[model samples]
Target: GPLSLSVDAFKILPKWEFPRKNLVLGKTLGEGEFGKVVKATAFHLKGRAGYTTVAVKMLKENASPSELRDLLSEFNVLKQVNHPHVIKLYGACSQDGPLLLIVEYAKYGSLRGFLRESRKVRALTMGDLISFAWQISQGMQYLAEMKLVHRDLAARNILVAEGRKMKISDFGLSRDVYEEDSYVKRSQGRIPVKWMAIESLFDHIYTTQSDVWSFGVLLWEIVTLGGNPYPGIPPERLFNLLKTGHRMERPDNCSEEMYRLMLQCWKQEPDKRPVFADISKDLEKMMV
Candidate 1:
């Protein structure tokens, strides 16, 4: 007997398409230092996947040639690394100016945005903070294992999804350790002075240890939920205090257990900072 395809069965047939412009660019999701991110839809042969959205980060046309090159470099580096806790770089645009980097769109947006709204509601809880820190450690550990460093790890750099799963992004500041002399290390370039380790700021050494110091500061940020880093410490006092090997006090909201971990990370000697693997393991146990 001849077989007939039902309407439902025919509709379920998959459609396939390579990376093409048919992908509809939607509204602006947000903006960052180098570009703006927009919501986009990809019309693949897989039958109207309404939930499939992409984040297209486009550089501004007015960017200088060097700036454009920098963005391109960032895309090249990001494409090579793949981890669950890190943003997935699907594709990119090769237009003369304002190139676009297509990534997995994050539903919950930046951790900083989450903190701001949650802080207003007084809703930032210990569990929430622990989850954020744990994810950051997982991502950082992955990068560290890959012989790379995420120089700009902060609340603003972490994106959350359903169940609060996080993905570390903004690889523009990421750097590979072995190739330091070949290119100006992105990890050491343009660090947030306040979050940096003493040796990193003064000696310009971009080690995994320096990254750990930044993670420690990030832990404090998670606990306080966007509260000022070094709240009472004035900028003028920073240099002298740092020279004397002083670090910011752990925020009052953090438990003593977590605060001790932060202090270990902030150790003046880079060698004293715990490795990312150890940090990730400890944080995972905390989750349990």
Candidate 2:
């Protein structure tokens, strides 16, 4: 049986119903279990002249109705969010064929890739790297203030916009929204285990603190210039390593103060982990 939307939500959906004709689809940026992200040019967005580049989170052909319903639910959340670091949601094409979420297109792509490229060119200074964390913390603080938790927080999920703007992308609004079948499996394996906290690994718990743990791994990624966390360690060993209170060694590029802050995020106890607001304040102090 096909799932359906609430009457109240259906009425609000058209408010964000973007004209399908206005979107000129481009190349595929990514694909997942239930949807694909494509690059596109949006015409007259917000009545601006010419076309605006956008990333479309498009629903897959075989997507279950619950997935569509989930997108619509997330659509409601995306509309109320207004933060500089968080990616902008312009509109959506929810009716025609596949459910489409038109969002801000990061010119430089994922932060992990951006950091990797910057490493090759020596483009980013220590200050620039610290600024990335600060910007992300600010975005995360906003989400926390709004009572939101980003289940997926990673450098690969973050994007770099024009002028080196770091915007936090995704908010449990991926094509794999209704996690019943597809969201739970990728590569026919486990969760984003490397990024997950110990509690999440065993108890399936998710909270702001768990997200903080993921952000710490992301901090490690930023300092190492996009090196994968727990490099060379398989998932089973990585799990045991985390359980044994073994934290990653600080990278040469990371400052002593910065590395300590990352440790704060990786604290064994969730309550001991730094809150987003505290992290944001500390990151601000790290700047000149």
Candidate 3:
């Protein structure tokens, strides 16, 4: 069920309205359960720039009330967050045929797609890998400071901007952490077991620490050029393997120090995992 809130609840947000006619849809970029992302150009108001290239996420025609609420939630979350390493929300069209959210266009698409493409051409330099990790950590650090936990943190959710910049996106699965700095899932929906931490998998608890664990998996994806975590293992078997102390092996290109950091993120004790601030600092040092 969806929250029983009026449309006025979202109207108070800054820069929250977009004209439906301003958006000119182009090719479809990607599709998800809720909607499809499409390449588009938006013409701003009179005094602003003539137009801006953007990506528009249009809700499905038959979107359920719960899904519409989810989209609204994402819009609210993005409205409150403004960071260099996080995706920018350019407003949305709710009165249109379908709800459309306009966001900054990522020229290179998702980091996962970029990694796969790079692998087919030239291998990414160590500096490039470190840069990606640093950007993502910075974004997570921002979210942590804001008391938000991105339950789904992975390379696929990271958008790639021009000049190799990475911006964290897709906040549909994100939620705010309270006094205890944690959130517990109450629904029985499909979860990403491979990227989840032990506590998250067992107790359905999510926190900044669990996100750190996912970051480690993203590092593996980057180093391995987007290889799937756990490879051939099924979800049930993977869970048992993790419980028995099995972890993914270091990618061939991952340096010893990087591998050590990944291992630290995988510690069974949630409190033992390093915070995103510390991880970002270490990555900054490595980059220099």
Candidate 4:
């Protein structure tokens, strides 16, 4: 009932089998603690065989065993999900010591990277915001409908492809909410402080409401084009300030309606956070 691939199964895939002719690695796109992404090509066989360029992500060698397992989990999750707005997983290869995954290349890269590089540009057009938000919401709706919680939702994880289409890419921190709730020893309570919901931050629980909270932060990132959630705020002061009911300040250029929605999302009580369906409806109206 589940999609499973053996170690040898990856060897025959075009992405791994024929790197020189079918797949050619290109420029280094980005690198993080867990992995590094690079541009590459994939050849398709048909009437006119042509190369389809894609992003090749290589896992970092020093990754923990837990990280390796999560890499495997990402493969499993991608196999189960098939949505127009969700990043497609081409395949994975562990032939090398560290695992490497092949995913659909997002030409424009991360929303955060786009925003930072376009700092001098004016605020995003309403159409741009609508299309981007709609795609992200569609992606999130797909995941939630599948009973999965994307524990980490941030600008860096949202990839903007050609034609202004957006897709959710990272699955390292995602978990299936319908599955067991006990925490693994190695991952007791690791939450992204800046993007985390108040309830989750304090109560150490990951749930759909927590995801909504993260979405609020994501909205902030979209509005500011990748402004740091709380720039210059000291880490030691974060917990105390949040505990005192002080929420993150909305950036200067953010719309009042967006600010209001963010406030609702940042409610101290998780139960008060709107569900993804309700959020989608509200965002649809906001597009107008």
Candidate 5:
């Protein structure tokens, strides 16, 4: 009874646990302050499939027990969420050693890097750029319906898979956004003030509408082909600018429709902001 058998005895394992023996780690895909993500090939992850390529969110060998438990809780939320535009959390190897949460692998990397590099080669057509916005909105709508708040959402948090598809995600060992120049130390914690909304800045309240605000900023980045959110305004000065009703100016190349859509998302009042469903439908109204 003590032995945990996996063969003919048919001992049970949690549905989410993909035994460490089933996993073969590959090169590191990304790493961060808290943990690292790696590429892995999972054997028998699904029925008799030979093996499948997957991404692993593994706690560092040095992480404390408390920190390890923190990572597992996130998997609980991820386990129940399913959507094409949202990163899928595959099985995890958490029974022993460094705990690993497997997920879908996307070799192309984050949207910020993707857009910046594409600018060099002119790889992204206009339609392709619009597609990113639409896909992300779809995911956001799904998450909203599921009642999960992504606390952090930005271009860098978005990942691209094959076929240039977009999925919202972030991982450690990927250089946490907390250390980014655009972020500043708040009393509570480091926050990307540039992507924050009015209430979020002063009241520290986050809602789906606040997420929409970040989405608007992401759209601005997309239109600019990957430039910082605020042009001349420094992080400290952004507070004063917003207090004074200043919104970012439209990029020279941005279309009026795109700029206006972003403005709607930036509405000062969170209640006044478009909800994710409205945002999704509004985006659908815009052609690729």
Candidate 6:
């Protein structure tokens, strides 16, 4: 039944099946409502004949059919997109046991934790900050070209590889803008209120512009070394504060130019927000 359900959609892609025996699971990397992601070593028997460390995101054993479909959708999205700043999906196993999606593992884990740790050690350099911001913009630019909306763009969703390389990850909340380049929620789901745009918070509509709004918050996160946005304010009050045109104060030591860019992204009107291409270019110039 599972095969029949997934075959029609996944048949176009290469066979992405991995025997459960070939995977050696290590420590858990992260866990949430969806499931758990664990670090693992996968042995390749075909084209490559060696073991590679990877991250395997395993769905809950009792995942509903709808949830299974969501997993398949994520796989389809990852299979179609390829960018240097985006995480690579090696393959997936959908027919048997627990559904597993294997991907390149980030050595240092989430950018959120990485920044905080670096801040604690006072090792984060201005160049490193600019590079990280530019990398995210580059990744978002690629997604914009593909007409996809990463509704959950935030520091927590970004992964860091060797040498502080940033790779956009976690596509469970991503959707392709096929119809009109906009998506409206029809069902209840978890929403990252603080990272969401005003329009997204009021109406469930999500667009690339809204993603830019979230990106601005992410930029603030980087400048603050991973400090939580709207610190000390309850989510309820924070929403009201935002409705009153209040934005977070610039973090200490953040450059005026960078803070101005963040303010541009937080513009009340979605149409006034800069596109990812422009954002990427601005960040690139900042690095020079």
Tens digit of per-residue lDDT, candidate 4, span 1-288: 122343345334433233334456789998874567889877761222787788877766676655655666777687788898889877655554446677889888998887777643335675476557667877888888888888878988888888867888888777887775422223444555788766565567777777888888888887777788878887667777877988777677767777888888888887888877787787888888
Q: Which candidate's TM-score is highest?
A: 3
TM-score of 5: 0.83
lDDT assessment of candidate 4 = 0.73
Score candidate 3 by lDDT: 0.84
* Model 5: residues with Cα > 4 Å off, grouped in runs: 1-13, 60-70, 120-122, 171-187
TM-score winner between candidates 3 and 5: 3
What would the per-residue lDDT of candidate 5 be over residues 216-286, giving only the tens digit for each residue? 99999887878899976788898888888999998877778889989999889877888878877777777
lDDT of each: 0.72, 0.79, 0.84, 0.73, 0.74, 0.84
Higher-lDDT candidate of 2 and 4: 2
TM-score of 6: 0.91
Model 3 — which ten-residue stretch has the worst lDDT? Answer: 6-15
TM-score each candidate: 0.83, 0.86, 0.93, 0.85, 0.83, 0.91
> What's the lDDT for residue 52 in model 2?
93
Off by over 4 Å in 1: 1-20, 45-51, 95-97, 119-124, 179-188, 232-237
Which lDDT tens digits does candidate 6 get at residues 1-288? 765657565644455677778888899899764567899989992346889899998776677665666667777789898998999988876564667899889999999988888762248776688889999999999998899998889898999988778999888778889779997887644557899998888778889999999999999999889999989988878668888999999889798889999999999999999998898888888877
**lDDT tens digits, residue span 1-288, model 3:** 236553555543345677888879999998766667899999973346888899988776687766677677788789899899999998888774777888989999999989988852156788888989999999999999999998888888899999889999888778889687998877643447898898888888999999999999998888888889989889878668878988988878788888888998999898998999999998988887
- TM-score for predicted model 4 compared with the true structure: 0.85
True-structure lDDT of candidate 2: 0.79
RMSD of each: 10.5, 4.7, 2.2, 4.1, 7.5, 2.7
